[PDB]
């Protein structure tokens, strides 16, 4: 039971690893997500007013992209923890 608690602590450390805290190594990711899962189982007056809109739209798009990358690496760590 003591060893299982230690295992649970390690698995929870693996599960809650975050992009801003840890680096997902490619050998680790390839080992724990491919191998072991298989083994186990004018035109400027307009632009004077549209430039803030275009810049803001680009910012929102980049923010969504960064959040999606963050989330995807989070599910990658979760899948490693499950394996």
């Amino acid at each position: 039971v003591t060893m299982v608690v230690v295992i649970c602590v390690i698995v929870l450390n693996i599960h809650f690893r975050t992009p801003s805290t840890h680096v997902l190594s490619e050998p680790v990711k390839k080992l724990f997500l491919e191998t072991l899962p298989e083994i186990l189982h004018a035109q400027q007056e307009l632009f004077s007013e549209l430039k803030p809109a275009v810049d803001g739209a680009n910012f929102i798009v980049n923010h969504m992209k960064d959040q999606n990358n963050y989330n995807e690496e989070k599910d990658c760590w979760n899948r490693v923890a499950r394996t």
Binding site: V5, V9, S20, T21, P52, G56, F59, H63
Partner: protein, 174 residues
């Protein structure tokens, strides 16, 4: 091993304080075995009280770590000395590295889009101040793990060497 648990798991108290509860159960176990005299303290009682103090200190340090982790980024500002010690200096000695390298109709649309952009910028700034506190909490948790390991090893070795080297006398009458 409570210091290796993430703060985001929400299980540090549920582990350390339940270890304390189990230690109380073993105190009940020994309550009917030890001598009741007061001339000295049994070494096994010394060891049990030492282990209880260790677990009690694990709870205290875990509470400090969780206070650092869940610290509101807006109402609690980082002192510059915390930033200097726990982000730049001690991570290098503890083996921790942060991955971060450090028309009337259209006018309403423009204002709205700028409002979303500004709100998202504020969200990123608040996030950054959040991860600073969280990284300080992690560093303070790796330091506390190492000092807990050191204190545990030193105390356990001292008590066990005191116990093991107590031999019967080879002479019935010194």
């Amino acid at each position: 091993f409570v210091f290796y648990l993430p703060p985001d798991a929400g299980e540090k108290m549920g582990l350390s304080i339940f270890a304390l509860l189990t230690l109380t159960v073993f105190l009940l176990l020994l309550a009917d075995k030890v001598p009741e005299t007061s001339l000295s303290v049994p070494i096994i009682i010394k060891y049990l009280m030492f282990t209880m103090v260790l677990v009690t200190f694990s709870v205290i340090l875990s509470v400090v770590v969780l206070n650092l982790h869940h610290r509101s980024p807006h109402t609690h500002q980082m002192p510059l000395w915390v930033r200097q010690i726990f982000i730049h200096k001690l991570p290098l000695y503890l083996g921790l590295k942060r991955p971060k390298p450090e028309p009337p109709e259209l006018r309403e649309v423009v204002s709205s889009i700028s409002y979303i952009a500004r709100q998202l910028q504020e969200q990123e700034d608040h996030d950054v101040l959040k991860e600073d506190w969280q990284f300080v909490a992690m560093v303070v948790d790796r330091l506390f793990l190492w000092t807990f390991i050191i204190f545990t090893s030193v105390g356990t070795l001292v008590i066990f060497l005191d116990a093991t080297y107590h031999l019967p006398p080879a002479d019935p009458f010194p």
